[PDB]
Write a protein that binds this ligand. Structure first.
Ligand SMILES: Nc1ncnc2c1ncn2[C@@H]1O[C@H](COP(=O)(O)OP(=O)(O)OP(=O)(O)O)[C@@H](O)[C@H]1O
Lengths: 456, 234, 445, 126
């Protein structure tokens, strides 16, 4: 499944908006407001009709998975007492469901009336229902492959502490959609399933060792367990190993029944005792990895490398340091090379690692009209300050007390009047205030030398 | 900026369209919309006469894949009688038709230039002495020239702010150009090269009517050598 | 209350460490896994004996406020492939409690035995109890000053009386070592305060009081001044208020734009405002006798982890100075890894944490300068990170630039590499265009 | 038509109200939602057999408090009464329209008049 375009109308922040998405990775950048969260929420709402067809619906009473009366646009006018709503609120999406199957579906809401959807939105539920039907007829030789939908919000690390099988069955396969678009943490689901997986692997290994007469039947159960573990560990390594050195997440009973990681020089330490960025990244990658493994068990090792779907991440570079920020996107693309990623960030280090066609800059005018444009200049491989000033419009020189004097000195020196006593006094004052090794002062000295050389 | 010299009357379609000038905003807008068929030849002539440089920022839009659009020096909503006057038309970057008009647009698409313009204080490329109003700094900024009256400085600052010539993109590009110029200066000092053979690549046009971008920065960087090169070959 | 030096022994990841703290602001800088939260937790443990002297925390049996078995260091024995625990863990702190009262107290835990404090650590609890006793005095005409203790960790987003009495005064130490600050609760209590003030102000218009009204006015003035120290320079916003006329919302004033709602801003700025306001309100509660200078004359210690969370690079450059201007008598100890924050402080206020193979830690000042420095220079020097990312074709581009520089553009291999890079990066790549211009320049000669 | 932005034509709405015996205020019988600020909140329980006094009390209190806020501000800092005084004028005109309507019935026979919100009397209508 893929989404090519999205258009909003009278939604939370935008009177209207049109935004297209790259095929593999898209990054949303916004200096002011909450436009990025609004776009992510709209996309998440547009994907729910598909999940609704698998019995995964508001059975836990998830009211955020539909357009609410709080999602409509309210205009406050100072000179008038009353305040009205903008109706209807609409979400229109274009994309692809299966190979060669292009569609366009819409969701709308009028005032306090219940939300309504058109006929293509119903066909999107019919497709999920027929996929479920094909999954439940396991007495077949053909294989059906399910897509992935996932949402990762900023609250994915808030209350990690509050809260099994793996086979080719409908019940086991459809557990990969459980709370897939939820806004809360999903860490304990993973921890319990991974603990069961490791314990079953070890117990079946010893059972096979003590009586291998059941080879042709039970030695493939252990092989499946090993292949699942290998896929998950490889996916996590792709992100953690090169930067931090930690690798091979496991479950250890001798460490008080905890998940542990290994380091060449620090040994085995429980994950709960590692740094914030490491825990964040591990949770983020593990979510996708085991959902991929549970959805498509017939892809033993290549479950993550051959799975298709859409993943949404808000603040992808949370808690990561600048050296780690320069490698997160490529790590994600290498771990899951068939998934469409839509992320948000405000870090020049991340923006310097993608091409300008994968960046969208969001802005509004006074009346709520929105625009999602590309950067005017190249960003791929450029220095961080270039991206910071050219794209985000921030001067790399901080606004310290001496900035205005520096600008005045630059303007005076570059225009030929550098031998005047006033200019020299300002020069010496700024040298003592900022030091003689300041790059701007150094290039001003170079400019003075060049101008002196020319006059000859 | 750079002074643009016009030496072409125009096109037959443009001349005919100017026979009955529009006399209000609605007529001007409608006829400009209907004139879309013969805009290509006018734009080709405009781009050729400017040596493929933007009329306000002096960038090579073709080399960056940003395009051009026809710009009215004086807004046709202000004085619609000149909607088809060839003397009031120039070519600006950021062709009209995802990076396009917005808050950070510059040149003809700048926010201020779209609303209102005061022709008394506006310095544009069609004024013979526009180049002496501006100076280019080492940090990527553009500022009014020191040798200006207390009245000319206000006009220069107003023009700079109206066209949004100090945006981050332009500042970064100009800073990079200055750095490359410094590199070239050091290279020619080291290699015992001549500082006129090289400068003819940047300051002298080509048979296909093309000039290196940021003409003013290069001319101001080499104070007298650039003037000597220009006088020798122009 | 001021802490000057800290020493660790066999604590989480440090075999040994000694770190000195600046009087007004100290910033710990390091990559992940270096031990910033390690130092902050040690400092927070060193201050708990004082908070334990008040009944507001004398019941606090939280296990996170004492040395745990997990805090002892583990050594990796590669030949034996085993983890060995090293004992004991020690935390030693030096500082001043009151004017002219220097002290040194220690805390240690041995193996699985309960943690144990030394003789001088109980005197801190005794001092806290004496302060609590003095606060509960009725006819006293000599003022009592209470210091501010506060810890704001990475979980500070997960989740009154205002009298001049002992209960209200000591309510300022409520969950101070595990404090939380999100904009919802801030909006709630600020709105309550403003509603009460509006009621008392209208009652005066109708029929042209005392302690309660003046306390409310002083609190509002202090909080507004503190937030102004943050928002009024980057933009024109000032004087956050509550407006019933504006659909019962909090608004700010701009000289050119008028009023704007606070709820139309981004989460990061709202959370920063909430943090500053919470510090100011705690200061107001702690010292009623200072009136509207409570935030400007209160002393204490505030610990912040990840001071630049969810902050745009524009606001990361104006956050330390805002805190220094709003609370000029408080000692801040913060952590960060953003170079925009570091580009606005002196090198005397920065500590870089490193280790060796054996686990001996160091905390040193940066060698170079960082005040008024470009972000890329600080990134390259302080952090050791190249501002230019290592994309796939970086090495090829460097090799081609080197080859063209020495004048070998005419060799077939150079042209083949140029064509490969053109097809990969494209024909409008700035570096390739510069190389082509250079090649053309070194011709015609 | 009411919910249209940037409209030139005005819309006039007719009144519709039923006042039955459920309206009566017997002995001891007796924050704003965003929908209470709409023109169409005037059709809220308009034909039902109920009492609608608390709606009026809440909205009228909001009016008076906003008006007093503007009075206090214009007394304190006389520097922002431009496009902010239009709102004050609207609030004042609404208050006086309601007050005159009520005066048309009580003043002549009973002598009571000028219903208003009072903060002195424990924040009550008086
Ligand atoms: N008992 C222990 N023995 C040995 N190493 C430990 C122990 N506890 C933690 N560590 C190691 O210490 C490091 C944790 O340090 P810390 O969490 O302070 O790092 P940080 O990235 O600077 O912090 P934060 O991201 O929370 O600001 C990790 O390497 C962890 O493995």
């Amino acid at each position: 499944m893929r989404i090519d375009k999205l258009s909003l109308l009278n939604f939370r922040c935008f009177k209207q908006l049109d935004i297209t998405f790259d095929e593999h990775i898209t990054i949303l950048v916004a200096p002011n407001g909450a436009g990025k969260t609004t776009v992510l929420d709209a996309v998440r709402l547009a994907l729910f009709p598909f999940i609704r067809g698998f019995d995964a619906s508001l059975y836990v009473k998830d009211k955020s998975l539909a357009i609410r009366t709080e999602d409509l646009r309210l205009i406050y006018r100072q000179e008038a007492l009353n305040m009205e709503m903008s109706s209807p609120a609409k979400i229109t999406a274009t994309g692809e469901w299966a190979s060669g199957k292009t569609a366009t579906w819409m969701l709308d809401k009028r005032g306090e009336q219940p939300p309504h959807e058109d006929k293509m939105a119903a066909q999107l539920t019919r497709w999920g229902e027929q996929l479920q039907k094909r999954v439940r007829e396991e007495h077949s030789l053909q294989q059906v492959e399910l897509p992935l939908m996932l949402y990762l919000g900023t609250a994915r690390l808030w209350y990690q502490e509050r809260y099994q099988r793996l086979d080719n069955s409908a019940f086991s396969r459809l557990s990969g959609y459980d709370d897939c678009l939820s806004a809360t943490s999903n860490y304990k689901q993973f921890e319990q399933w991974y603990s069961w997986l490791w314990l079953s692997y070890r117990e079946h290994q010893i059972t096979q060792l003590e009586s291998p007469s059941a080879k042709l039947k039970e030695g493939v159960r252990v092989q499946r367990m090993k292949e699942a573990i290998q896929a998950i560990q490889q996916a996590i390594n792709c992100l953690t190993q090169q930067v931090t050195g930690w690798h091979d997440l496991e479950y250890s009973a001798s460490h008080n029944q905890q998940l542990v990681m290994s380091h060449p020089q620090y040994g085995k330490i429980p994950l709960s005792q590692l740094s914030d960025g490491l825990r964040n990244a591990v949770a983020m990658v593990a979510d996708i990895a085991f959902r991929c493994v549970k959805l498509n068990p017939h892809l033993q090792n290549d479950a993550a490398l051959k799975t298709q779907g859409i993943v949404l991440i808000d603040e992808v570079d949370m808690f990561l340091h600048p050296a780690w920020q320069q490698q997160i996107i490529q790590s994600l693309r290498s771990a899951f090379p068939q998934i469409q990623f839509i992320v948000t960030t405000h870090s020049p280090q991340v923006l310097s690692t993608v091409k300008r066609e994968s960046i969208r800059l969001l802005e509004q005018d006074e009346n709520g009209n929105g625009k999602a444009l590309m950067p005017l200049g190249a960003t791929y491989g450029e220095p961080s300050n270039d991206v910071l000033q050219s794209v985000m419009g921030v001067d790399p020189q901080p606004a310290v007390k001496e900035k205005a004097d520096l600008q005045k000195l630059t303007g005076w020196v570059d225009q030929g009047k550098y031998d005047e006593p006033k200019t020299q006094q300002l020069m010496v004052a700024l040298e003592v205030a900022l030091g003689e090794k300041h790059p701007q002062l150094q290039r001003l000295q170079r400019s003075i030398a060049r101008q002196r050389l020319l006059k000859g | 900026m750079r002074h643009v010299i016009k030496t072409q009357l125009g096109t037959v379609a443009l001349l005919t369209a100017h026979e009955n000038p529009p006399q209000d905003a609605d007529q001007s807008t409608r006829r400009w919309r209907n004139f879309r068929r013969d805009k290509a030849a006018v734009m080709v002539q405009l781009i050729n006469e400017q040596y493929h440089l933007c009329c306000y920022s002096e960038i090579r839009s073709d080399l960056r894949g940003l395009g051009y659009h026809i710009e009215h020096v004086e807004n046709k909503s202000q004085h619609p009688e000149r909607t088809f006057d060839y003397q009031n038309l120039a070519a600006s970057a950021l062709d009209s038709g995802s990076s396009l008009k917005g808050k950070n647009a510059f040149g003809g698409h700048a926010q201020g230039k779209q609303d209102v313009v005061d022709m008394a204080k506006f310095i544009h490329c069609h004024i013979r002495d526009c180049s002496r109003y501006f100076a280019y700094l080492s940090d990527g900024r553009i500022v009014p020239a020191d040798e200006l009256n207390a009245q000319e400085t206000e006009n220069a600052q107003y023009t700079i702010d109206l066209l949004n010539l100090n945006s981050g993109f332009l500042q970064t590009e100009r800073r990079n150009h200055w750095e490359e110029l410094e590199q070239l200066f050091d290279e020619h000092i080291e290699k015992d090269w001549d500082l006129q053979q090289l400068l003819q690549l940047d300051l002298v046009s080509t048979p296909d009517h093309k000039l290196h971008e940021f003409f003013s920065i290069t001319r101001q960087f080499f104070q007298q050598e650039a003037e000597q090169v220009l006088q020798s070959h122009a």
